[PDB]
Design a protein around this ligand. Structure first.
Ligand SMILES: CC(C)CCC[C@@H](C)CCC[C@@H](C)CCC[C@@H](C)CCOC[C@@H](COP(=O)([O-])OC[C@H](O)COP(=O)([O-])O)OCC[C@H](C)CCC[C@H](C)CCC[C@H](C)CCCC(C)C
Ligand SMILES: CC(C)CCC[C@@H](C)CCC[C@@H](C)CCC[C@@H](C)CCOC[C@@H](COP(=O)([O-])OC[C@H](O)COP(=O)([O-])O)OCC[C@H](C)CCC[C@H](C)CCC[C@H](C)CCCC(C)C
Ligand SMILES: CC(C)CCC[C@@H](C)CCC[C@@H](C)CCC[C@@H](C)CCOC[C@@H](COP(=O)([O-])OC[C@H](O)COP(=O)([O-])O)OCC[C@H](C)CCC[C@H](C)CCC[C@H](C)CCCC(C)C
Ligand SMILES: CC(C)CCC[C@@H](C)CCC[C@@H](C)CCC[C@@H](C)CCOC[C@@H](COP(=O)(O)OC[C@H](O)CO)OCC[C@H](C)CCC[C@H](C)CCC[C@H](C)CCCC(C)C
Ligand SMILES: CC(C)CCC[C@@H](C)CCC[C@@H](C)CCC[C@@H](C)CCOC[C@@H](COP(=O)(O)OC[C@H](O)CO)OCC[C@H](C)CCC[C@H](C)CCC[C@H](C)CCCC(C)C
Ligand SMILES: CC(C)CCC[C@@H](C)CCC[C@@H](C)CCC[C@@H](C)CCOC[C@@H](COP(=O)(O)OC[C@H](O)CO)OCC[C@H](C)CCC[C@H](C)CCC[C@H](C)CCCC(C)C
Ligand SMILES: CC(C)CCC[C@@H](C)CCC[C@@H](C)CCC[C@@H](C)CCOC[C@@H](COP(=O)(O)O)OCC[C@H](C)CCC[C@H](C)CCC[C@H](C)CCCC(C)C
Ligand SMILES: CC(C)CCC[C@@H](C)CCC[C@@H](C)CCC[C@@H](C)CCOC[C@@H](COP(=O)(O)O)OCC[C@H](C)CCC[C@H](C)CCC[C@H](C)CCCC(C)C
Ligand SMILES: CC(C)CCC[C@@H](C)CCC[C@@H](C)CCC[C@@H](C)CCOC[C@@H](COP(=O)(O)O)OCC[C@H](C)CCC[C@H](C)CCC[C@H](C)CCCC(C)C
Ligand SMILES: CC(C)CCC[C@@H](C)CCC[C@@H](C)CCC[C@@H](C)CCOC[C@@H](CO)OCC[C@H](C)CCC[C@H](C)CCC[C@H](C)CCCC(C)C
Ligand SMILES: *C\C=C(C)/C=C/C=C(C)/C=C/C1=C(C)CCCC1(C)C
Ligand SMILES: *C\C=C(C)/C=C/C=C(C)/C=C/C1=C(C)CCCC1(C)C
Ligand SMILES: *C\C=C(C)/C=C/C=C(C)/C=C/C1=C(C)CCCC1(C)C
Lengths: 225, 225, 225
């Protein structure tokens, strides 16, 4: 890895600045609900920072042999999404006021979506790498389903400021989230159609949007109170 | 690994079907307690599926050198039991209505039972592999103890449908769970007395029973409401 | 690793005895709050035991090449602190009666402090190992901050036996905790100024104090009721 260094260093900067902003922002917050939202939201980019730094400094990169090649796989991406997506799922669940049962379904389904997708990236048998991608995406579909059809109805029985803020975020996650299994598939980890430099650029845009952008939408609203 | 492939492929099928059944089953459930039970219970085999698939497709298998040999160790078994046994512990705890303190003891003890048992499997010094087995089983004994003597009394102060369903499950876990440290010890991971093909068959029967069977007993009862 | 074996074997003994004491001690406890305190507190050394044993028996030791050398890094230390420090953070939070938001901040910050510090230990580029140490310590400072200025005020609105016991423990963690990034820096994992034998002795004293000592202070008080 070298050409994409710029993308990784750029993602390390943004996530870093993204954490600083939220920390400084939530400093004056007294409301225990809002205070929880800033807690969950600030932690997402903080983790993303460390994981992006590990990729830039070289750590988060590995080499997996599939096909007639040793392929550079950035695993820190999976280590990032493992703790990051569940927290993003909690923001949405606190907002909408979800059941302890549905949250456990989602966190349980999310862990499977990431780990299973990680197994795909490390799989040395090219073909197989696609089975796990299939299992990983099936689980994402299940998540975006209850997040769209379950949470929405759940947000409707709440204050309009909350109801709407959720609508924005709902669309934002459904659209962003479903980009990963598409970027992955065409990127170097799957059916190579796009080079690593681009794949890395693409994931960099989704990560910043999903982690920092989502945070802005949410934290800068009154829906968190 | 090859001869046992049939056992792994059979366990991948059952766990897979086991997840589909519970998902489709709990679909009509409205009760937030039952809905939590289906949440916890459905997730157990789902994880088991992925872990069993990883073993079949080759991933979940490693080679550990102990003795005058490089020994095939299926680690995905430990990765499975790590998230699976705590969830099974939560089903029993929700049912019986346990204290947040005892649950933390059990989950804390369970994590130690699996990780410690994993350390045993990966230990390159043959002798040592038995110390960890001893520490892993001591922790299982501690778990089956409060699960038998602590939870039972706890179930007694509840509706008889719940009290009884717990009794069934209680026996089912105490008996099933204590089979693992026995199968392990005689299997290839320990004092080789049984071949890998059998060890794998045995764990396959315990896993299906513990994950799917237990689920059936529980989900098909009214005790979950 | 060999000369320090005595330190590791001594830490394995103490942690082991430390677990036995608390188990036997909390056996008569009926109070659900105290029962939670013994639950959280007993589990800290139990984990520490297994991790210290893994280091003695050889498992928890790795070799990382940085500089003109292959350096012996005991990673089981990080695997220990990963589950151990969050639990110690929960003791303090239950005692003081903290918000679910602040606890998530602390556990989230703590995980980053350990993992980030682990990345440092495994980093093959000598220089970099210091960036992660910096990120790991920044996160510890953030933790000792709210643990000192946030929790204290929180303890003040409680029974004096609790208020005071917290004061003792507060100082004990702030002082002990800030010794690790200092021992690390001068030890073999960082700017080698002290040999492994000493580094290991030092961490052995902090671990016993933080895990067992802290437990004694806390469990032998009435503040846990
Ligand atoms: C507490 C301390 C903490 C707050 C301070 C954080 C500082 C930390 C961000 C500094 C980062 O500092 C980054 C370093 C290294 O940058 P490199 O030259 O790009 O490294 C490439 C390497 O050889 C591996 O590449 P491979 O992975 O493809 O193999 O300095 C080079 C710095 C970069 C040139 C600038 C990057 C800016 C960051 C976004 C910040
Ligand atoms: C979303 C998508 C998702 C729902 C679909 C899941 C499909 C998935 C189950 C298909 C599985 O498909 C399994 C594959 C491979 O089976 P193999 O030939 O046995 O592989 C042996 C390998 O060489 C390693 O052996 P080693 O570990 O010992 O080294 O097709 C062979 C398939 C098997 C012959 C049939 C197995 C049936 C499964 C139980 C289903
Ligand atoms: C349930 C069962 C459970 C309760 C029982 C636990 C028993 C368990 C503590 C026994 C431990 O038993 C420890 C063993 C090995 O001790 P060693 O000789 O020091 O091993 C060095 C090794 O070669 C690697 O060194 P390297 O890491 O530097 O490479 O017996 C040697 C024992 C030691 C001499 C004594 C240690 C006492 C312990 C503190 C107990
Ligand atoms: C109710 C049931 C009947 C239905 C449930 C199951 C069903 C929903 C699942 C169907 C889809 C599932 C199997 C996953 C399929 C993934 C699909 C996107 C295909 C991915 O396809 C990826 C391609 C990669 O192509 P290259 O060989 O690298 O060459 C391209 C070169 O770069 C130029 O391989 C393709 C190789 C093979 C396609 C891999 C097998 C997958
Ligand atoms: C209050 C206290 C006094 C008591 C607390 C501690 C006490 C309860 C602990 C005692 C048991 C504990 C040490 C664990 C012992 C495990 C026990 C089942 C022994 C396991 O024993 C396994 C055998 C393996 O035999 P092979 O060499 O492979 O040859 C067999 C070949 O396949 C044919 O080795 C055996 C090798 C050695 C036995 C390994 C040491 C263990
Ligand atoms: C608001 C902002 C302006 C401020 C925010 C950032 C700021 C707070 C961060 C400053 C500190 C941060 C960069 C971390 C610095 C760590 C500091 C303790 C320096 C550690 O320094 C460690 C030494 C190691 O020395 P050896 O080469 O092994 O030789 C010694 C031999 O054993 C005898 O290297 C030293 C090598 C280099 C020092 C490594 C770079 C670090
Ligand atoms: C480049 C950067 C990313 C380096 C990385 C370091 C980073 C990994 C460590 C920091 C971890 C953070 C991500 C943890 C998230 C922090 C947020 C959740 C803060 C949310 O706020 C939680 C409150 C808890 O106390 P109260 O109950 O009184 O409100 O913080 C208490 C607020 C305090 C009292 C005010 C002062 C806060 C200063 C900033 C400290
Ligand atoms: C071969 C298979 C295993 C592939 C593997 C994929 C798998 C890993 C991903 C799936 C993960 C699952 C295991 C997660 C467990 C799901 C169970 C807990 C479902 C329990 O039910 C939870 C509810 C949450 O919403 P409510 O509050 O409205 O009730 O699901 C909402 C119910 C919804 C609204 C009804 C429609 C559900 C369909 C089936 C989706
Ligand atoms: C050398 C050693 C470390 C080997 C390692 C083994 C170790 C890893 C396994 C043990 C794991 C433990 C660390 C788990 C922590 C245990 C503590 C939390 C115990 C706290 O107490 C919790 C209660 C739960 O039941 P109640 O709701 O009725 O009170 O224990 C119920 C109390 C019971 C009913 C009384 C009898 C207890 C005996 C000792 C068993
Ligand atoms: C360090 C930077 C902190 C700086 C924004 C000052 C924050 O201080 C103002 C807080 C409320 O006190 O909210 C600030 C709320 C303001 C009303 C909005 C200011 C946002 C600015 C436009 C900065 C945006 C930074 C991007 C979110 C990060 C880039 C990705
Ligand atoms: C960092 C924030 C978010 C929302 C990241 C989400 C990541 C995913 C939803 C990943 C999805 C994947 C799928 C569906 C299948 C292939 C493997 C992936 C992990 C890339
Ligand atoms: C998947 C469901 C269950 C109930 C699996 C449980 C697994 C165990 C109880 C494992 C026990 C072990 C012991 C006691 C000691 C050796 C190592 C094992 C992990 C096999
Ligand atoms: C086992 C109990 C405690 C309190 C252990 C705590 C460990 C730390 C606070 C570690 C701190 C580190 C820092 C701050 C930076 C370098 C890496 C360390 C993990 C050693």
């Amino acid at each position: 890895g070298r050409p994409e260094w710029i993308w990784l260093a750029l993602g390390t900067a943004l996530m870093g600045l993204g954490t600083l902003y939220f920390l400084v922002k939530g400093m004056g917050v007294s409301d225990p609900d809002a205070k929880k939202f800033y807690a969950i939201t600030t932690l997402v980019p903080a983790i993303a920072f460390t994981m992006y730094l590990s990729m830039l400094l070289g750590y988060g990169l590995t080499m997996v042999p599939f096909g007639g090649e040793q392929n550079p796989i950035y695993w820190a991406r999976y280590a990032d999404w493992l703790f990051t997506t569940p927290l993003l799922l909690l923001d949405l669940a606190l907002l909408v006021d979800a059941d302890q049962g549905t949250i456990l379904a989602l966190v349980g389904a999310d862990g499977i979506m990431i780990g299973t997708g990680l197994v795909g990236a490390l799989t040395k048998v090219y073909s197989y790498r696609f089975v796990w991608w299939a299992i990983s995406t099936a689980a994402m579909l299940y998540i975006l389903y209850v997040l769209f059809f379950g949470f929405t109805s759940k947000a409707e029985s709440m204050r309009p400021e909350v109801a709407s803020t959720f609508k924005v975020l709902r669309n934002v996650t459904v659209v962003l989230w479903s980009a990963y299994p598409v970027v992955w598939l065409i990127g170097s980890e799957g059916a190579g159609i796009v080079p690593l430099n681009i794949e890395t650029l693409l994931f960099m845009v989704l990560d910043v949007s999903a982690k920092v952008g989502f945070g802005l939408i949410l934290l800068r609203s009154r829906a968190i109170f």
